[model samples]
Target chain A: QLSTARKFKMITGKDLFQQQKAMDTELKKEDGEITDLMEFVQYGLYLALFQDNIVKAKSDFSDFRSSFEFDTDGKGLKELVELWQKEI
Target chain B: GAKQLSTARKFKMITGKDLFQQQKAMDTELKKEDGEITDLMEFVQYGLYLALFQDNIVKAKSDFSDFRSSFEFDTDGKGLKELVELWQKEI
Candidate 1:
């Protein structure tokens, strides 16, 4: 019954956005490796944009791939999620 | 409720203005009068949970409207929570 936000806070003792701020700071220290941060972002956004509809998730990912011509590798997934946020 | 404050806080970080200042917005009657210190970095995380992710898009966008108002909302009318689940391999 706990909301996802509250559940996260309970588990991590911080809000979702708090993690983001932390990640950003860490990412900066490493001169923007980008891979790790993207990995985190990809899953987070996936769940945010899609909760339980497996079928739709795949369909949309495929759509996203062809639409943007990104590869289907782990790298590509991160790219896609980032591209989405840039859409305005 | 707590959700409203969270949503409103997000708005404040992005625009540097109160949510009500932008919405033309609330305080006292809503019970946010406890002097809770809203933070900026709270909007920075999205590693997995959006902080407001637990509420789903509907509750998030209603009176709170944080999720909806924060971005362009290009999902059309489908709503974010209604469509989901992604896996690199088999589900």
Candidate 2:
């Protein structure tokens, strides 16, 4: 999908399941994929970090993975992602 | 590729310069070479986005106001006043 004003590409999905149903069985994990702009992921990381939500924090980091211009080939972001992935 | 350097050494090299500078330069070079105008808008956007990371709305608002003030509008400070009013209303 496209955002208003032709500014961004928007892909929307939500995983909503009842808490009991989610825990009661070996439910298939709901998967989502989107080619989001790199900025949103970085911004979301800041927001999630402030809220101290580890899962969201990791997701934000993953969102930034491909489009991130950071030095992943170097070491900083790669190391950070590795550390974050362990937590998730 | 440099087997002589340990991972720790490599990691140090990764941060040899500022992360902001590295990201901006690399991204601009590869993705938006034409967007080299280097306006203050990017800094303003970054500042506001980083405020969420730091979880300080007060400082974010101050930074946002600072950006508006720096526009040098010929409104006799009316632009800043309007920004303040809008901010107050949002709060």
Candidate 3:
């Protein structure tokens, strides 16, 4: 048995954001809204982790685009992933 | 969906929309000092912090930059409220 994150990294050679992008896209609505808040938040996490700009969040709410910058030491990402992992 | 997270309404106030609503939920959770709300809130807070941290890494002229970012998410959402308050002030 392999840890999910490790397995994903080894098999895909992609960051968690890439994996979640597909999930978010799947969860996103054509009308451009997300019914599930966690999913929407997951989108935010992955976006910020990738150091992505706010350009892609066209339909998202004002809250979606944050002026508050996230820390990039990757510790924040580690905490966030840990948070999600526990919820599941 | 068979049965949802039961956090739908809370997330309604959440989901990164109204600061007023967000603050309301914070108070609600603060009153109890517990709930999944804080975890969700914590997640968002960490996410924001992570983004800033990464940006700083790029901007750092040298291998080391003063990464003095705040991480006040102590726990029990009571601790996480510090961050929520920060967001309230900024936004």
Candidate 4:
């Protein structure tokens, strides 16, 4: 059997951090501590960079709930995802 | 691998609930309320998908720029994609 792992290149946390760093520099060039564009673009970059972790976080929480445990509604779930991202 | 798992475990340890189901439930509610999701929704969902399934940061940044410009146009929000596509080709 031929190994297929070489077909894809994964993005590591370091890569994500570098991307964030570059964006921060660009944001600083505009002389704003935190502007709307920075926040918006960073939001997109965060999702792109750490999607797998986010998915895993979602999955773990879902499984825990499905087995009859902690419960929350839809809005709460949205909040949870956002909360998870903040830490990332 | 260990880092990702640790992150998830930390989240589970802290939240103590099922998150995925909540996301789906919330998504359903939004879909119902909007009749159809907006471009902003697409932008967010696509970003998340890129996070989870794809790892091309360059592509993500490009796509993001397109959406940002289209969103900032302040038009009727009807030509967002068209504007993005047109602008995307220009640069």
Candidate 5:
């Protein structure tokens, strides 16, 4: 069984931040201003990496993206899967 | 989700004052007669544990790095907080 700690075994600060730097998409909208993609990605990765639940991570990412006025590109989700593959 | 449920379970086991007091007790336990903490680096780890109990995971991680660097450099207690503050600023 994959334990919580084991879920984070492959994740590193370097990989996390490297992916964070690559996000060029906006994540959410509040009051007509876009929220940083890094924040959304950070929280999503936190769930995916440490929480050991990709389904929740993907669902939350979709929900967060849907809150914006301008449709978000799939870049965040793409990076998320790539990062998961690399790390896990 | 399991993580949320687990976090909620752990959440019930602690209070803010519990952690504050635990930090205080460890402080005294690690303190020397000279009024500074003995093995201050170890105390930082102790504090990190409390940060986890308090559900301050981000702070726990930040302090973990603080423990690593301060322990490596043989930093004294007075400088420990400064080191963590500096680390947070960079984040």
Candidate 6:
């Protein structure tokens, strides 16, 4: 079912900034750029896995947007979506 | 309109603006730590949820970004009391 993929299949990861510091929990503490980018790419891959379909993953993406939109501002949803659209 | 959620949910999630005020209420009621204002980010979501799920939008926007004040204080300790006292005197 669509709910299964939304719930379990998609490898939902952290938002942008948290991913930058995922490498051994050490970020900019005498670190390099590549490691940080690699971690970001790891999060990007989570977004990529759900990239194949949009309709079925509506609730998941909706929840994802809700998480950030509510946290920062609703405008953040458009910004994050546009950011990934450009990156991909 | 009939209530979407009971008055309880509206009170907790909708009418609860002023995070500091809500925290004060929780402390006043002696709710568990888990029941306190743990999800700091959910403050906005609760507003949206109330608007969407409970059909109350007027009170919702009262806590929006435009209503919020942004400041970049110089982080001084000594001047705080003096400044507050000066403001209080004016009041």
TM-score of each candidate structure, all chains considered together: 0.27, 0.18, 0.21, 0.22, 0.23, 0.27
* Tens digits of lDDT, candidate 2, A11-54: 11211111112223323434412223223332332333233444
Model 2, which residues run further than 4 Å from truth?
A: A1-88, B1-34, B40-54, B68-91
Chain A TM-score for model 4, please? 0.25
**Collision pairs in model 2:** none
- B1-91, model 1: which lDDT tens digit per residue? 3435354454344434553342122222122332211122122222112223434543333423453244222232222223222111112
Error of 2 at B14 (Å): 28
The sequence of per-residue lDDT tens digits that candidate 1 reaches over residues A20-73 is: 554667776757755555544454444434344545544544454346332334
- Supply the TM-score for candidate 4: 0.22
The fnat scores of all predictions, in order, read: 0.00, 0.00, 0.00, 0.00, 0.00, 0.00
TM-score ranking from best candidate downward: 6, 1, 5, 4, 3, 2
Candidate 3 residue-wise lDDT, B1-91, digit = tens: 5652222222222233333455475446544422334333444444333322333423321212122222232222333335445444534
Q: What level of docking quality does candidate 3 show?
A: incorrect
Error of 1 at A10 (Å): 12
Error of 4 at B74 (Å): 23
iRMS values for every prediction: 10.8, 20.0, 12.8, 18.2, 17.2, 18.6
True-vs-predicted CA distance for residue B34, candidate 5, Å:
58
Regions more than 4 Å wrong, model 1: A1-17, A30-38, A54-78, A86-88, B1-91
Model 6 over residues B3-91: C-alpha lDDT tens digits?
35543344345444543354355344333322322122223233333433334545544433322332111212223234323324422
After TM-score superposition, what is the CA distance of residue B76 in candidate 4 from its true location, in Å?
Answer: 28
- Under CAPRI classification, how is model 1 graded? incorrect
* Local distance difference test scores for all models: 0.37, 0.32, 0.38, 0.36, 0.40, 0.36
Write out the backbone clash pairs for model 6: none
Q: Which candidate model has the greater DockQ, 1 or 5?
A: 1
Candidate 2: tens digits of C-alpha lDDT, residues B25-80 = 53454333233222322332233233323244455445445644452212222322
